[PDB]
Amino acid sequence: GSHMYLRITNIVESSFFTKFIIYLVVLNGITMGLETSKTFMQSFGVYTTLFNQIVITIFTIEIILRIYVHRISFFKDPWSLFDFFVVAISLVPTSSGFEILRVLRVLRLFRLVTAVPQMRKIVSALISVIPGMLSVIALMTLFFYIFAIMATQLFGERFPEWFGTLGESFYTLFQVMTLESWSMGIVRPLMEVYPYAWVFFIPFIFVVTFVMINLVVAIIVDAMAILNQKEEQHIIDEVQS
Amino acid sequence: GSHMYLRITNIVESSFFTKFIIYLVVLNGITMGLETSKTFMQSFGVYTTLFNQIVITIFTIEIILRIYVHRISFFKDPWSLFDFFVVAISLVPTSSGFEILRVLRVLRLFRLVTAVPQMRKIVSALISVIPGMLSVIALMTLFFYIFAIMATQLFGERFPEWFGTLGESFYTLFQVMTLESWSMGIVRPLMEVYPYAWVFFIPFIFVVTFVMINLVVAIIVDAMAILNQKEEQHIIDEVQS
Amino acid sequence: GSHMYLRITNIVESSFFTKFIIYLVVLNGITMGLETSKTFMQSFGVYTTLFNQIVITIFTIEIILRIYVHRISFFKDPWSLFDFFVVAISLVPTSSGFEILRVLRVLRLFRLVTAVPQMRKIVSALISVIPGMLSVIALMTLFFYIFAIMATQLFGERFPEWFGTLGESFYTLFQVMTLESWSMGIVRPLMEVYPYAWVFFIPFIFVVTFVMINLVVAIIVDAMAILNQKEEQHIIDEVQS
Amino acid sequence: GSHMYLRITNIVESSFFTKFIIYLVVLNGITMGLETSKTFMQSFGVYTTLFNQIVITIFTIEIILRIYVHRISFFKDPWSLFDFFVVAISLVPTSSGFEILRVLRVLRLFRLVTAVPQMRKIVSALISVIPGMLSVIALMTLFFYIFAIMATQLFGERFPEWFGTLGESFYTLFQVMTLESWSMGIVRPLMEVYPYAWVFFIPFIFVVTFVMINLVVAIIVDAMAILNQKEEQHIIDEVQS
Ligand SMILES: CCCCCCCCCCCCCC(=O)OC[C@H](COP(=O)(O)OCC[N+](C)(C)C)OC(=O)CCCCCCCCCCCCC
Ligand SMILES: CCCCCCCCCCCCCC(=O)OC[C@H](COP(=O)(O)OCC[N+](C)(C)C)OC(=O)CCCCCCCCCCCCC
Ligand SMILES: CCCCCCCCCCCCCC(=O)OC[C@H](COP(=O)(O)OCC[N+](C)(C)C)OC(=O)CCCCCCCCCCCCC
């Protein structure tokens, strides 16, 4: 709380600071689309590469400033950690030879989420449902795991591409979950060799489908139940009192 | 409010006027189906072309009359603006050389929506949900935008048809959203060259799917919550009073 | 109400009568599966053909008896009319030369629905939702109709199989509604010739999808609202009284 | 209740016993994944085969102990019966020559469900919805059965792979239910020979789809109705009393 501390603290926390960052993101966003065209890149490429290095500099300063202001409270904020790791990624230099990190640089456009509070509320809303499903996700994954193992050893030898490997079978089973080509592309070919392959995949399709629908039904109905508790208690004690 | 004004105002606003338009639309509707058959067109084509020019004349008169009656209130009515722009389109002549406008002429059948009030209520109902989703739509589109950029530069060089271009990648990503052939048609081919391509598309499939379902769940549950507020207040103050 | 009338009326209305019919249906049901195997048919075919003619005789008698008992009240009962028309179909003889009616004979197994009251309740439940959707169905069909006409004339000339005809276009548009191969099978081929074909089908996919989901959401939420009216009135007037 | 009985009864019922089993399952689970790699199997295969025989021994002892403790109450517990039949399967020796039972051995990983009570609650939750649907399932299956018979005899002769047989037709009809390639893969080929085949499959697609959605809607709305009964009674009699 020194006098130097509050100097920067009043900047960082200013609406102009936030607004300025958003301007940059929206600008670097448009810039990253244009960088997609080799035509544009041949003409104006050096400009954009610099604007890019400019922006990432600013964002590094910015993240350093917020760390001064917020201190340990910054590394316990998920939105700040995200901003951190996105900016960290952008710093690993293009010479790294692993172009994956060059492409991951686009994740900085997600600042337009962490910085706009109406976006934060949505993402928070969406994510909020997930912790109640962790056990169902675990059940589903165990299920996938068991069936991946059985598939690999029923079909891996004749169908190595689809089932030669735990991973390949996981992949194929996820594909059948989405029902994408599950019969013409997978199970019908399978059955020219394993005529009962349908006894594996149909029940797999039933379970996995039943569970997902039931997840959604339970979420709606159990929420409506809580809304009803809060209304019961209110009505019932405006009557008692 | 002159005496000439109300002369036409009583026509325009008459049930017979409305009924007459609907008759025409339903007639021009049947006519536009028959115009689809070259057989029919070879026999009776000139008849229909004229009936068509007739109807569009009437509709132009009609729209002019409603503008006299309603004045500035007409250009603040979305149903009137629609009727306007559909009739405007039909006026651009067949010589224009841009047959798109010739085909857009079919949109005049949508008068059967703007003119029948039971239809207006449905469309109004449906559209009513949209303004609350604008922020989610924006989040989704930003998401698509970020992933379109990463895809274009991970896969555009070897897969120009599916990913050579921001637009092509947008297209393909929408296709994967609907899950149409996402694995046999897209990701499996992709992985003969980029074995980890599944680390891109599966999480993309999870997010986009999770969000859409969660949109629907939130709409049902948040509405049921409002219905519960209005019932709380009623019950609670018939008790207080 | 004569003494002969009630003689048969007590049979027709007896539990044994109903039970007997169900036995027959379940028996003719098993029989119609076995008739599917040419092996079985070569061995036991003449037996089954007769059992079949037997059963349809009985059912004709049965339907005649119920008409005596129920009189005009029988032709105002949808379950009876169904039983009627299914038995009518079975009477048109195999010599007719239109094997469609030979196959429609299988519809008599649906007696196992019209005769078992737990089934009747389900089907009644399901059908009950439909009259409230008639206007939405009409909107959807008008929509399909307008888009079928535009598609036929944008794409019918180069793509006669998918769009050469109002009917063909209806078909294809229903296929795109279910999203079956809409992109790899239809729109991607289309775009090698009409690069903007995506401006037609994507918005078509949005509308048709939006509407169906919104139909379901409205049904759940509007029902929950009615359940809330009936509970309001009860609570509110046990308080008033 | 002898003194020897309670000796083992206190073990079986101990938290350490349960915990120990779970450790084993999670260990044999990891082991069954590694057994998937021929590389690993060539190096460490004999180890795993023994660990496997070890674990199944333990589980046999374990199941015998729980039978002593629980007696007839064990064969009326579905979770115990499952554990039983999974362990029974594992006992049939590898010499049996029916490798299906060798693969079914993986089902022992489902102990991680029967033994962890948070999992039991989920599966119990999910299964709980099913008994109310039995009649709808029956209606659906009758429906499939009737349509399988009609399809087999309309299309079995020209399309033996898809419809030559009651079973083949069942399969294909389930495929059309999931909408997987129903048009490009099935109905479009069908219509080059049977131009009206769409009069069969489209209504089939409507019914089967309508029913499934309606099942889900009814489940949500009928539950919300019960939640409303329990809240009515509470509110209404805190007012009466
Ligand atoms: C109602 C909820 C439903 C949730 C269902 C979840 C069930 C599990 C989903 C798994 C998805 C499919 C994963 C997959 O593709 O597996 C690949 C990997 C290893 O494969 P690998 O052999 O490297 O590569 C296969 C492709 N190839 C041969 C061309 C290189 O295989 C693995 O290594 C297995 C990875 C397991 C991932 C578990 C994901 C947890 C879900 C997170 C929750 C998100 C909520 C929004
Ligand atoms: C009862 C359950 C208890 C919990 C158990 C959870 C942990 C299980 C881990 C099992 C790990 C098994 C890994 C494995 O077998 O890898 C197989 C393959 C590699 O095959 P390999 O033949 O070694 O490749 C040789 C390559 N070459 C020729 C070039 C030399 O590589 C792959 O296929 C990739 C491996 C994907 C593993 C996916 C793991 C899913 C975890 C699910 C957890 C569920 C918890 C409830
Ligand atoms: C839960 C809500 C979910 C909403 C998700 C929305 C996410 C975004 C959907 C985008 C849909 C796909 C658009 C698409 O095809 O992109 C094409 C264009 C430019 O492509 P272009 O390169 O011209 O042509 C590609 C095809 N080709 C090469 C054969 C000519 O690409 C563009 O120019 C991008 C256009 C962006 C459109 C944004 C649409 C907003 C949705 C409206 C809300 C409707 C509610 C009923």
Ligand SMILES: CCCCCCCCCCCCCC(=O)OC[C@H](COP(=O)(O)OCC[N+](C)(C)C)OC(=O)CCCCCCCCCCCCC
């Ligand atoms: C952090 C985000 C901030 C917000 C940013 C939103 C605005 C972004 C606009 C980016 C515009 C980039 C346009 C672009 O790169 O076009 C690429 C291609 C043309 O490639 P090009 O190589 O120029 O074609 C040469 C043709 N030749 C050979 C015959 C001479 O043409 C195409 O591929 C069509 C371009 C489709 C653009 C789709 C725009 C989606 C907007 C999403 C907005 C999300 C807001 C939350």
Ligand SMILES: CCCCCCCCCCCCCC(=O)OC[C@H](COP(=O)(O)OCC[N+](C)(C)C)OC(=O)CCCCCCCCCCCCC
């Ligand atoms: C995990 C949840 C993520 C959710 C957000 C999505 C993030 C995006 C992940 C993107 C992964 C894309 C992987 C892929 O296959 O892309 C292609 C690259 C490069 O191909 P490469 O393997 O170099 O083969 C080149 C062959 N050649 C020379 C003949 C052309 O392949 C590679 O270089 C493989 C490298 C694997 C990277 C793994 C990245 C982990 C996720 C990123 C960090 C989280 C951000 C929130």
Ligand SMILES: CCCCCCCCCCCCCC(=O)OC[C@H](COP(=O)(O)OCC[N+](C)(C)C)OC(=O)CCCCCCCCCCCCC
């Ligand atoms: C949320 C509700 C969604 C409802 C959406 C309904 C929208 C309309 C659905 C239409 C379905 C597709 C009909 C179709 O395939 O059209 C074929 C016919 C004439 O085709 P045609 O040229 O004879 O044959 C085409 C095939 N070919 C060339 C190989 C012989 O084309 C016609 O003749 C048109 C027939 C219009 C049928 C209208 C159906 C009303 C729906 C009934 C409600 C059921 C509720 C359970």
Ligand SMILES: CCCCCCCCCCCCCC(=O)OC[C@H](COP(=O)(O)OCC[N+](C)(C)C)OC(=O)CCCCCCCCCCCCC
């Ligand atoms: C503003 C809307 C007002 C309401 C209008 C509703 C009534 C519309 C009826 C239109 C009837 C048009 C029939 C038509 O054009 O048929 C075209 C084709 C036959 O083509 P054609 O070239 O004659 O075949 C010649 C055969 N050859 C070479 C062997 C001699 O045959 C076909 O393609 C089959 C025709 C399918 C008709 C589907 C009708 C859907 C009704 C939707 C109603 C919506 C109400 C809200």
Ligand SMILES: CCCCCCCCCCCCCC(=O)OC[C@H](COP(=O)(O)OCC[N+](C)(C)C)OC(=O)CCCCCCCCCCCCC
């Ligand atoms: C809203 C609820 C929706 C429920 C819808 C249920 C409707 C019926 C589903 C039937 C699923 C398809 C069964 C199927 O593939 O049929 C095959 C068998 C005999 O086929 P088969 O000729 O041996 O083999 C065909 C394949 N081939 C030629 C290559 C060897 O065909 C048969 O033998 C018939 C088997 C009937 C099974 C009935 C299943 C009851 C559902 C259980 C409820 C689960 C709830 C989680």
Ligand SMILES: CCCCCCCCCCCCCC(=O)OC[C@H](COP(=O)(O)OCC[N+](C)(C)C)OC(=O)CCCCCCCCCCCCC
């Ligand atoms: C009104 C309804 C009353 C209830 C009726 C329920 C019971 C129906 C049972 C019917 C059994 C018919 C079995 C049948 O026809 O099998 C046909 C084929 C075998 O064909 P086949 O030509 O004998 O094979 C000869 C093989 N060869 C050349 C090597 C010598 O093999 C197959 O295709 C497999 C058979 C699949 C049977 C699926 C049964 C579904 C039950 C649905 C029950 C619904 C209850 C509400």
Ligand SMILES: CCCCCCCCCCCCCC(=O)OC[C@H](COP(=O)(O)OCC[N+](C)(C)C)OC(=O)CCCCCCCCCCCCC
């Ligand atoms: C409308 C809602 C219905 C809902 C319940 C479903 C009822 C089932 C309808 C079945 C329609 C099947 C039509 C179809 O394409 O089947 C094939 C037949 C016969 O083929 P065909 O056209 O004779 O060509 C033979 C060519 N050859 C000599 C070289 C082999 O094709 C024909 O013979 C065409 C005949 C069209 C029959 C139209 C039937 C109307 C519906 C049945 C009455 C309602 C029952 C509730």
Ligand SMILES: OC[C@H]1O[C@@H](O)[C@H](O)[C@@H](O)[C@@H]1O
């Ligand atoms: O206590 C919080 C502090 O953590 C340290 O790691 C940093 O160097 C400081 O700048 C930060 O304020």
